Symmetry: C2
């Protein structure tokens, strides 16, 4: 088996929030279609799979010219992990070697250029994850964590809470748009974060995650320059 | 000198962002007035001081029936620390014993009831800070910090990045609305965070910080039930 670069787009019919989110249109193209177009235009992938339990989602994926894996109910439930869906898609097409990239349709401003830029960071020898990330609005060192009921401790030092942000290490959070992994490592570890993890930095604007009707319009407003 | 409970409201004329922010009206009352009303209605304070360099701000403070400390230019500049303003106000009225609470006008949804609730957490024997805080939208353990150029490390463990949030310690960030300190300790430490710090938890809604015109309207929308 030669190595393959696989993109997996997980899109279930009964999304846990906004109804029918994956097929909602933005600029005349479904969220699903925006992410398929990003995958195709990246030219990074040998195979692009949409994994779904819904008939309308499957028909949309076929109309965009990509492969469909049908997920049974037990893998498309509110308790089913994303990793189990990706593993199932890989098993269905018979790939256990190469790279596998998770592209969630809820990140419609992540483009094919972003995907190519992220892919350029992947190290084929060391094989840690590449994860897209954006800067933290609120610095995570300026927080306290609960240790006992009503008792809290600084994330690191109490003095960090008053430090000028520019004097603190730069901080980033995964934004959900892109997770790139070595396929065999993802199968063995059964997770998306595999050390040593590299970050592909994206802007706040491009990192928008669609959960609400207002996220949809904001994303549309951004697309208009 | 008997102990006094002092509230200090820092309000300079040349705020670093929105122009004339401290006197902008919300529901027919200036931001400054909302915070003065919170201080008065809390009944927590022996003295309420507005520290300012601006004539219009001073006149507003006098119209609400509180004391005014005039800050010279060197203490009302873009580089002047908040702590130096509070220290100057305390020196001006001659208080070095009791408690001192910083109330920023940019937190107009923080009420007198919030202040009283926060004050009830202050420990007069141990004398750590009480700081108002709100829950973190994005969990601070699900972040990576820059260590070298293009190299990042998990805040704590890489496995935290995939942990269900409810399995992680609860996390909070100071929201800027209330800082309560022992006066002598604040003078000695020259900072607002003094161990052991206790948190007064506020909702996201009540924690709104005014920096933009849209923050102003959102805060007004919230005031309407
Ligand atoms: Ca091809
Ligand atoms: Ca520590
Ligand atoms: Ca009185
Ligand atoms: Ca660590």
């Amino acid at each position: 088996m030669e190595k393959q670069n696989i993109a997996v787009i997980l899109a279930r019919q009964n999304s846990k929030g906004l109804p029918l989110k994956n097929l909602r249109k933005m600029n005349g193209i479904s969220l699903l279609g925006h992410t398929i177009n990003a995958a195709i235009s990246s030219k990074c992938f040998d195979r692009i799979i949409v994994s779904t339990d819904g008939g309308l989602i499957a028909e949309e994926a076929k109309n965009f010219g990509v492969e469909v894996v049908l997920r049974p109910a037990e893998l498309a439930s509110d308790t089913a992990s994303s990793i189990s869906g990706v593993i199932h898609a890989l098993e269905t097409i018979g790939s256990n070697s190469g790279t596998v990239t998770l592209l969630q349709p809820t990140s419609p401003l992540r483009t094919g250029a972003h995907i190519r830029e992220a892919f350029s960071l992947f190290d084929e020898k060391i094989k840690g994850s590449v994860v897209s990330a954006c800067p933290m609005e609120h610095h995570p060192l300026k927080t306290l964590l609960q240790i006992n009921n009503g008792e809290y401790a600084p994330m690191r030092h109490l003095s960090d809470l008053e430090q000028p942000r520019q004097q603190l290490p730069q901080a980033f959070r995964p934004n959900g748009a892109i997770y790139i992994n070595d396929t065999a490592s993802l199968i063995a570890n059964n997770c998306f974060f595999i050390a040593p993890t590299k970050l592909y930095i994206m802007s706040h604007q491009d990192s928008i995650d669609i959960d609400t009707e207002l996220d949809l319009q904001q994303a549309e407003n951004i697309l208009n320059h």
